[PDB]
Amino acid sequence: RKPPKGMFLSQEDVEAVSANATAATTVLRQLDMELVSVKRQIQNIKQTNSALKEKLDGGIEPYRLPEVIQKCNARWTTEEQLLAVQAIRKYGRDFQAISDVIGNKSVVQVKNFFVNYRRRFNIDEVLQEWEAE
């Protein structure tokens, strides 16, 4: 029903090697050239990727900023409220950002703010203004 294992004898393949006298030698050159062509392509990417890899020498250690460990608070200094509105103008509804900007506010307090301070700060207008970008 099936060949010995490892032998590879499909109808399709057999035909294509018997088609003419050298149809076998042809097929086995269209593959040596198909192999050298890929190997030279592999060298090209290896050189290209070796160049992009030196531009990242040293990584981003020089641009790293130390961790701000600050315990989250519940009250809203007017300073904290002013930061808020101005982050909404910059960040829409990305509460994670806004929570990151203000720094000692949990992501829920941030969304809670959107309701309590909404009418007093025209948040619609602020979000509406931020939509046009």
């Binding site: 393949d13 018997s18 076998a24 593959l31 890929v38 990417i45 641009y63 930061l83 720094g103």
Partner: protein, 666 residues
Amino acid sequence: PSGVEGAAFQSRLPHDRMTSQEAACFPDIISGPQQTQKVFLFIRNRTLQLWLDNPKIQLTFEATLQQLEAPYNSDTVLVHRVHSYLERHGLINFGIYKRIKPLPTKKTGKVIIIGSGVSGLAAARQLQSFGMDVTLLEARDRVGGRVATFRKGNYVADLGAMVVTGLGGNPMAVVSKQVNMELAKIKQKCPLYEANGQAVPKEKDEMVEQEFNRLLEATSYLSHQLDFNVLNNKPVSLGQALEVVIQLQEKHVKDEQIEHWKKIVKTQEELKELLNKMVNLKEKIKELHQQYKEASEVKPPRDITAEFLVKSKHRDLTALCKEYDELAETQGKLEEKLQELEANPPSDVYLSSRDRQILDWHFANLEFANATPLSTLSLKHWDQDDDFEFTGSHLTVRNGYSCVPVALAEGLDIKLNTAVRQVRYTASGCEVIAVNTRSTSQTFIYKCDAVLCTLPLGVLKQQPPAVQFVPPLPEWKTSAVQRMGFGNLNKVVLCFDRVFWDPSVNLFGHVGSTTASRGELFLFWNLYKAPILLALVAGEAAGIMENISDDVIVGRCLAILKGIFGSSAVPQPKETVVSRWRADPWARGSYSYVAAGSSGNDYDLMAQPITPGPSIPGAPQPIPRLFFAGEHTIRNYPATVHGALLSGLREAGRIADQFLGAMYTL
């Protein structure tokens, strides 16, 4: 197998079923109820055993019935029918037995037997066994034909057949009990030695051997499962199909190599796209820092927009630092795959020049067993005889296989140095015209009721004919002759004063340099009591080495031996003979082979006798007059001694049936 059932197996007969042969003579029984078949089968298997247990003495019908027991020895015509059948088709009292009833005083019928090789001898002895008048005409000055044994002083070596291919249902088993053949088992260990002169390492030996055997099953698969049997209107041969199998393994290797590297590139390019996204991120992060640095430089106390800027830039820079960290994470997983993929490359070659050369030796061995270039073997049928292989070890005939022809020949009318030249067969009888090989002017004429031809297939093949058939053989027989293959292999006997090889290894190989030369002296045999090596010449090498002097040939032997054993341990051989079987005018080759375009059925055609046309027109259909035996006529055992002998038994049965009557068919 053992018992009565073992006698059936040892006679190549199913112990529990009736053969087509027996249905012919016993159509009452095989068409009758199952119980009577069992009695008949028991009588056949019993009788066989009695002969097989003691084949040095004729098995008479009385002897047989005496030792059968009821219910079986109750019907005496059933026993007489069975025993006469067996005697007639040579399943019992064949060979060289002592006879109880000495020979009928006056004979009936005259048969001329062309050729005194084993098939000839074996018929002759059976026909005379049956009360006929037999004369054999032999072109050589000796009997045995292709069973040739060189003898000089104390050296004995066979230039012809030298191996008994197992005693497991082999008629030669019976012959060896009858004649003193000293049979010696042949140990299969065969170390291969490359052209440098040193052993192929065991890992290489097993690797090629396994690839070889796998390659063979692949051809079989191509034959039976893909019907790859005709290419460009010509039948495919074994050789063609081995190429196409090897090519498709070489193509697979390239195909797999190509798929491996196409995963490196498809990953080298995810990395490429990843680094681009990271070189851009680092540059974006560079600018963000500077913007945050400048915003931080404005010293406090600041207004809230300017405090928001420092806070906002810091948030944006941490976000872009999360991102670039997630990416040199991803850069590590894809850098690891590239190292892992690179370390696991697929196989570089299918076979190396060294691997292929050893493979070429395994092909020479296959060209040896078939005495022909693999390009001539029928892919579909070259192995159609393998189902009937005997069981057990192969053996050599340590005292020379000619002892068997010579033994068969005693008590027989053999004209030596008599070359048949024309066979004339008519509705009323036959005349064979032969000449004397020494002075061909002297001409002889032999009249007879029937001619039994054992002319080698190579001889039957000559154009122009060495033997003329009058009237010419019909096209159906002459076409089988052309279609069949008659191959060639030759031996070089080397006779030394000194044992300098391994006395415990019976055979050993030499690996050739080229495909083209894979058969030149590729195998050596240590079979004999005395110091004798025997070197084989197979494949395309065979027919080319017959154009080369013995010294050049013995030279190339000593070369090969010096390399494999050291250039000072190999002395000069005392005696050397080099066979040239395709040159031999009474052989024209070594033995037959299923040629591409032939089948095993051609072997059946070769055995079909020839019936002449009527002399008087409108006279009744005559008797068959020309009968054929020999190695190329027995489908299930060609190219062998045992096959020859069986064919001789077979015609002598059927000739006796034709000319003396089969009283056992009623």
